[PDB]
């Protein structure tokens, strides 16, 4: 456990989720874009608290844990790839194969008994839609589709995006993203006026608890997630009042967006259609360490040919990225950061005072608790400990 047992004991409906401060192990996670990693140019990154090294050899990606088995230094301090298929630690020259992590040579002692008898941790790496996904887990990985939202991998779905490091636990990012009522913070986004969007300030729930969402655990692909259906029976708020007097109004644009929002394990949201009626948004909140995450944003738009892909890419740079990914989502960034203090000591998970629209968040917490493939622990980071 990564959290005080007294707290976990109190949270009977989603203790595993609360305990998963470091993220869920045995899931695929996007960490960079294919174009960011060149042939023979190793790149470092931290995923779920683990320091990793990614390299492209003969066009294919390989992932090695960035920590020599010998004295635990990061190989990346001084990269020495002496042959196309290996990397040699700069310290005592222990050499590892990129494909299987096997310690194949030691330049400081070619007669060492450790040669061929030790193996550096490797992780599966797969590129899809110009995105680099890493399976931070053990054993043969499941198909990538299990950890991706519906349609992301569609043949003609052109994926473009942006990635950066955000200072907040991944869970605060997830819940902010799937939060039905947080739409309020986007009321002044330039995207609203500049793209003539229809956007309420919130929702007056309607129907029973079960009707508030659609829990998906019967997906043939294995996907596990939740759909937010607060808008099916709820009355959208377009006139916000105080004391019965209207103080704020929603956006009365013509473009209808986000009629279906869904969150999927290990932590990826799908907003459709967004930021335009003919587009979709897929964003991951990838755990780096307990205090940070990658905010991996992608926008998808069907494209039949290079012409459309080019015009889309062109439109991405000039409008969507600056007006949507940035102009709209930037407020999500400081919103996440604003929740850090309340949850930093883990007490926020007990003292939070939820209201109706949080039913969606609750459903996600339970789904995540029930269908995650493993709880990452600090011991996974330093080295598993046991006595048997």
């Amino acid at each position: 456990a990564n959290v005080d047992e007294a707290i976990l004991k109190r949270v009977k409906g989603w203790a595993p989720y609360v305990d998963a401060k470091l993220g869920f192990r045995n899931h695929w996670y996007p960490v960079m874009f294919s174009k960011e990693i060149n042939e023979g140019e190793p790149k470092t990154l931290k995923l779920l608290g683990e320091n990793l090294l990614v390299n492209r050899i003969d066009g294919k990606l390989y992932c090695l844990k960035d920590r020599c088995l010998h004295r635990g230094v990061q190989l990346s301090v001084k990269v020495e790839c002496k042959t196309k298929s290996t990397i040699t630690c700069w310290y005592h020259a222990w050499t590892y194969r990129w494909e299987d992590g096997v310690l194949c040579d030691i330049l400081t002692n070619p007669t060492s008994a450790q040669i061929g008898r030790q193996k550096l941790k490797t992780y599966p790496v797969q590129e899809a839609k110009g995105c680099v996904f890493i399976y931070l887990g053990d054993g043969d990985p499941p198909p990538l589709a299990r950890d991706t939202p519906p349609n992301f991998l569609d043949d003609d779905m052109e994926i473009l995006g942006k990635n950066q490091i955000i200072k907040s636990n991944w869970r605060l990012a997830v819940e902010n993203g799937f939060d039905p009522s947080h739409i309020y913070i986007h009321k002044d986004s330039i995207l609203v006026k500049d793209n003539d969007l229809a956007l309420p300030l919130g929702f007056a729930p309607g129907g029973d608890r079960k009707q508030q969402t659609r829990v998906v655990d019967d997906d043939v692909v294995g996907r596990k997630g939740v759909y937010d259906l607060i808008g099916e029976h709820g009355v959208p708020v377009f006139e916000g009042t105080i004391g019965g007097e209207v103080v704020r109004e929603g956006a009365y644009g013509e473009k209808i967006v986000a009629n279906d929002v869904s969150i999927w394990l290990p932590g990826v949201l799908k907003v459709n259609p967004f930021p335009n009626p003919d587009m979709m948004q897929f964003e991951w909140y990838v755990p780096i360490d307990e205090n940070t995450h990658y905010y991996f944003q992608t926008l998808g738009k069907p494209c039949a040919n290079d012409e459309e892909r080019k015009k889309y890419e062109q439109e991405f740079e000039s409008k969507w990225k600056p007006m949507a990914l940035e102009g709209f989502n930037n407020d999500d960034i400081w919103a996440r950061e604003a929740m850090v203090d309340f949850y930093a000591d883990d007490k926020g998970w007990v003292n939070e005072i939820l209201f109706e629209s949080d039913e969606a968040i609750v459903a996600w917490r339970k789904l995540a608790s029930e269908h995650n493939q493993g709880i990452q622990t600090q011991a996974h980071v330093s080295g598993l400990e046991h006595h048997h």
């Binding site: 004991k9 109190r10 949270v11 009977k12 409906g13 998970w349 007990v350 003292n351 939070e352 005072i353 939820l354 209201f355 109706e356 949080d358 039913e359 609750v362």
Partner: protein, 112 residues
């Protein structure tokens, strides 16, 4: 109406809880402590949890969300993080039938 028919007193075992949904109103929770019946709002005052899905220990109901608790007799908070009192509804047994009040009790016209 004034008295809401819930069930037969015999349909509830000691130490159990029963949720009572009402048309156009918030649900209630009827608890059986021994051979006595008490009732309160079903929704925890600390959030949106259903107390009838919680754990009843004697005369104290524990919310399943965050571990808060209340005394089912007075509706007063028994464990943090709960701080707001539960509305309490009178229960009575007529002909071995359990009835719960339609309106909550008030600090109006009773012991000083």
């Amino acid at each position: 109406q004034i008295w809401l028919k819930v069930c037969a007193a015999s349909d509830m075992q000691p130490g159990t809880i029963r949720r009572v949904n009402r048309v156009g109103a918030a649900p209630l929770a009827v608890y059986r402590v021994g051979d006595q019946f008490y009732a309160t709002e079903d929704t925890c005052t600390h959030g949106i949890a259903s107390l009838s899905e919680g754990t009843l220990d004697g005369d104290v109901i524990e919310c399943p969300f965050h571990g808060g608790a209340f005394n089912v007799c007075t509706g007063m908070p028994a464990s943090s993080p709960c701080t707001v009192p539960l509305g309490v509804f009178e229960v009575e047994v007529k002909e071995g039938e359990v009835y719960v009040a339609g309106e909550k009790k008030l600090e109006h016209h009773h012991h000083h």
